[PDB]
C-alpha cells in the first residue's frame, strides 16, 4: 500500500542519514584551527557606476575581467567598462521586471530574464551597430530567476516552477528538464568543468544535477528556510549557500554533508548573494542590512565588511582574475572594490 | 591625457548617459501599479475595460492608461505558481497595489480575506497602500435580494451587525444589500486597521466589472498617496 511505500522512503532517508553520520569523522573547524587567520582585510571602492534608474537585481562579470553586465528594474541592461567607468551598450528590454542576467564566456552574447517567464538572449557583436535579440526561450511556467551560459549554444535556466532547464539556443527547445524540487528555485552555479550544476530552491534544499544524464545526484538539506544564493568553490568539489535564516553554509559533494556554517548573532537578515575569491579562502556574501560581509571560508569569522550602499545588496560577483569585486544594490549603484 | 579612441569612447558613453536622462524624465513621471486577485474576481474584465476605454506561458502583462495627462502602469501576473512570497519583493516601490475581491461568492470570501491579510502584513509591502475593489456588486445584489443563498451561515457575526452611520447608498436600493456589502467592506477594513501603523492606508471602493469610473478612482487614490508621501519627505509631518 501507499503506507508501505512511505515507510520504505522513510527507511531509505534514515539509511542516508546514518551513512552521513558515520562518514563525518572530524569537523572543518578542528582541522583548520591551526592555520593562521586571514586577518583584517580592507577593500576600498575604486569605482562607482552611475546610470541605472531603478534598483539592481543582477550582475555578471565578463570573462575578460574588464566588462560587466548589469540588470535593473527600469528595463535596462548596461554593459560597463570597469576600468574607465564608460558605458559600452545600453540594452532596453521588452519587460521591465528582470531579475537575472548573464554574460557569455566568449563575450558575444548576454542573457536576461525575469517575471516574463522568458530568457531573452542578446547578440552583442553584430554586423550592424545595434544589439539585437538573438532568441527568446519560452517554456518555463514560473519566473526565470537565474541563467548561466555553458557556451554560445547552451544555456541553463532556473525558474520559480520547481524546475531547471537546459536549452539549445539554435533551436529554442529544452534538451533536458531537471525536476525534483518542491519550491521556487532561485540560484544556479555551474561547475568549472561545466558537467554539473547546483541549484537552491525555497524547499530549503540544494541539488547537484548532471547536465548530460539529466538526473539529480545528491540532495542537501541544511538550511531552515528558502535558499537565495549558491556558488561553486573554485575546486569544483564544494559549494556555499545563502538563505533567509541569515546563515551561509558550505557543503561538499564528495562527503555529501555540510562542513561549516557562517552566522553571527548580531546579523539577522537574510543573504542575497554569495561568491568566492580565486583561492576560495574568502566567502563574500551580500546581506539585507545594506552591507556585504567577507567570511574566511576555512574558519567562519568575518575578515571584513563592505559598507558603501544605502539599500540592500542584491548582486555580487568576483572577477575571474580575482582582481576586484562588484556589488550592486537597490540604490541603483554598482561599486567595484579592491 | 588619453588617446583618440578613448575620447570617442567617452563621447559614446556621454551620449548613452543623455539617453538615460531622457528615460529618467519619463520614468519618474509614470506611476506603477500591481493588480492582484483571485480567478473569480473580475480583474481580467477590469484590465480589459481599462485598456479598451484608454504568449502562451507569459508571466506578466502590462497596461497603459492615462487620466488627466498622468501616466499609469498596471501589471498583473499571469503564469505564476500558487506561492507569492518571493516575486512580491520586486514591487516594493510601486505606488499602490490594486486588490480585487469578489463580493458575490461567499464560499471563497474567507480565502480572499486571508490573502488580503497576507498582502497587508508582508514585510516588503509596508508603506505600500492598497486600493480595494470590492468587485461584482451587481451579482451581490441578486445574491442578497433572492434569499436562496444566505450569508449569516458562512459568517456567524452578520446577525450582530448594524449598518454604519457613514453608509451612503446613493442610487436607491434595498437596505439589505447595503448592509451586506458594508459588512464585507468592514471585514476587509478590520484586517486593514488592525496593524496599519499609519505608514499605509487602504482605500475601498464598490466597483463592478464593467464600470467607466475605475481609472478615476485609481487616479484619486494615487493622488492621495503621493500627497501623503510628499507630506512625509517635505518635513510637514
Amino acid at each position: 500500500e501507499l503506507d508501505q511505500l512511505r515507510q520504505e522512503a522513510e527507511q531509505l532517508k534514515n539509511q542516508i542519514r546514518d551513512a552521513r553520520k558515520a562518514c563525518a569523522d572530524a569537523t572543518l573547524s578542528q582541522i583548520t584551527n591551526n592555520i593562521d587567520p586571514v586577518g583584517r582585510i580592507q577593500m576600498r571602492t575604486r569605482r562607482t557606476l552611475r546610470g541605472h534608474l531603478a534598483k539592481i537585481y543582477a550582475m555578471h562579470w565578463g570573462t575578460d575581467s574588464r566588462l560587466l553586465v548589469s540588470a535593473s528594474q527600469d528595463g535596462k541592461l548596461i554593459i560597463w567598462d570597469s576600468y574607465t567607468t564608460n558605458k559600452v551598450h545600453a540594452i532596453p528590454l521588452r519587460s521591465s521586471w528582470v531579475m537575472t542576467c548573464a554574460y557569455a564566456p566568449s563575450g558575444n552574447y548576454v542573457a536576461c530574464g525575469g517575471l516574463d517567464n522568458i530568457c531573452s538572449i542578446y547578440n552583442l557583436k553584430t554586423r550592424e551597430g545595434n544589439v539585437r535579440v538573438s532568441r527568446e526561450l519560452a517554456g518555463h511556467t514560473g519566473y526565470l530567476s537565474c541563467c548561466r551560459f555553458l557556451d554560445d549554444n547552451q544555456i541553463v535556466t532556473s525558474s520559480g516552477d520547481t524546475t531547471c532547464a537546459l536549452w539549445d539556443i539554435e533551436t529554442g527547445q529544452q534538451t533536458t528538464t531537471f525536476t525534483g524540487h518542491t519550491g521556487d528555485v532561485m540560484s544556479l552555479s555551474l561547475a568549472p568543468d561545466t558537467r554539473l550544476f547546483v541549484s537552491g530552491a525555497c524547499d530549503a534544499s540544494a541539488k547537484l544535477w548532471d547536465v548530460r544524464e539529466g538526473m539529480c545526484r545528491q540532495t542537501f538539506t541544511g538550511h531552515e528556510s528558502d535558499i537565495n544564493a549558491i556558488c561553486f568553490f573554485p575546486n569544483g568539489n564544494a559549494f556555499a549557500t545563502g538563505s533567509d535564516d541569515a546563515t551561509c553554509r558550505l557543503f561538499d559533494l564528495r562527503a555529501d554533508q555540510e562542513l561549516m556554517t557562517y552566522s553571527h548573532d548580531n546579523i539577522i537578515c537574510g543573504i542575497t548573494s554569495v561568491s568566492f575569491s580565486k583561492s576560495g579562502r574568502l566567502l563574500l556574501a551580500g546581506y539585507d542590512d545594506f552591507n556585504c560581509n567577507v567570511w574566511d571560508a576555512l574558519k567562519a569569522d568575518r575578515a571584513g565588511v563592505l559598507a558603501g550602499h544605502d539599500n540592500r545588496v542584491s548582486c555580487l560577483g568576483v572577477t575571474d582574475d580575482g582582481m576586484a569585486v562588484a556589488t550592486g544594490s537597490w540604490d541603483s549603484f554598482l561599486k567595484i572594490w579592491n | 591625457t588619453l588617446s583618440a579612441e578613448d575620447k570617442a569612447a567617452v563621447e559614446r558613453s556621454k551620449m548613452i548617459e543623455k539617453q538615460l536622462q531622457k528615460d529618467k524624465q519619463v520614468y519618474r513621471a509614470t506611476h506603477r501599479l500591481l493588480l492582484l486577485g483571485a480567478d473569480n474576481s473580475g480583474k481580467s474584465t477590469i484590465v480589459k475595460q481599462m485598456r479598451i476605454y484608454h504568449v502562451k506561458t507569459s508571466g506578466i502583462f502590462e497596461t497603459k492608461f492615462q487620466v488627466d495627462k498622468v501616466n499609469f502602469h498596471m501589471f498583473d501576473v499571469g503564469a505564476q505558481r500558487d506561492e507569492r512570497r518571493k516575486w512580491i519583493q520586486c514591487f516594493n516601490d510601486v505606488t499602490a497595489i490594486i486588490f480585487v475581491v469578489d463580493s458575490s461568492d461567499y464560499n471563497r470570501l474567507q480565502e480572499a480575506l486571508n490573502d488580503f491579510k497576507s498582502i497587508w502584513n508582508n514585510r516588503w509591502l509596508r508603506t505600500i497602500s492598497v486600493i480595494l475593489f470590492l468587485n461584482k456588486q451587481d451579482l451581490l445584489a441578486e445574491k442578497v435580494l433572492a434569499g436562496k443563498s444566505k450569508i449569516e451561515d458562512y459568517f456567524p457575526e452578520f446577525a450582530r451587525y448594524t449598518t454604519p452611520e457613514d453608509a451612503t447608498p446613493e442610487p436607491g436600493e434595498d437596505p439589505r444589500v447595503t448592509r451586506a456589502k458594508y459588512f464585507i467592506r468592514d471585514e476587509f477594513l478590520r484586517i486593514s486597521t488592525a496593524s496599519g501603523d499609519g505608514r499605509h492606508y487602504c482605500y475601498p471602493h464598490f466597483t463592478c466589472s464593467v464600470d467607466t469610473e475605475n481609472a478615476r478612482r485609481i487616479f484619486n487614490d494615487c493622488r492621495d498617496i503621493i500627497q501623503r508621501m510628499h507630506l512625509r519627505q517635505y518635513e510637514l509631518l
Partner: single-chain antibody
Amino acid sequence: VQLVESGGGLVQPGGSRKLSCSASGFAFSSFGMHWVRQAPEKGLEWVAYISSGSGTIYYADTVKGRFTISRDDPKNTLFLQMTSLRSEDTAMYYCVRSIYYYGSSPFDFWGQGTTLTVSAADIVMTQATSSVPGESVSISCRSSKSLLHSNGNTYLYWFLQRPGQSPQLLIYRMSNLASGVPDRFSGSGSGTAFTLTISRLEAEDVGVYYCMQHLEYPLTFGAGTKLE
C-alpha cells in the same frame, strides 16, 4: 551593410561640389564616419571625420578651412562640402564606417568610392618596400613616433586594396583579425616597427597593403606595398 556614395565629376578650379554618402543596412546613428581619398595613382590620404552625435569634427591641415563635413542621421546620409577646389584635390573619395568602444573594430567597412577630377609635426608612416603563390610573404612598415599608448593599445591598422575595389580591413590595433579575414593573415609589431605576415598566400590576396595610425589626428597612411 552598404555605403553607396555619389556626387563626383569634372570641376573647374575655384569651384565647389558636395559629396553624399547614403548608408543602408546598419545603425548609422551610432557610427563615426570618415572621408578618405587617394590620388589616381598614389596612396590613401585622410580628409575628415565626424563623430556620432556630431559633437566632434576633425579636418586635415590641407583642407582645414575649405571643406565641411556633415551628417543627417534621420536620413542616413553623410556629406562633404568642398569649396575652392584646386588641382591637387583630385582623387576618389571614400566613405568609411567607424565605431569606438572597448573592443570595437574601427574602419571596418568602406564605401565603393566616388571620383572627382579638377581640371588644370605629425606621425609619418614609411613602407620602404613598394613591390614584392603558395609562399609566406611578410610586409613591414615603420613610424616616427611610438604607437604604443599607456593603455597597452598599439593603434596600428592594416588595409588591403584589391586591384578593382575599395580597401578592406584586415588587422586593427596591430594584432586583431577583422571579421571575415581568414586566419592566414597575422599582425605583429614592437611599438615603432611593425609587420604583416600572410602564411599560405592565395591568388585572392594580391593588391596594395596600407598601414595606418589612429594614435592622434591627423591620421597618416603610408605609401603602401604592392604584391604581384
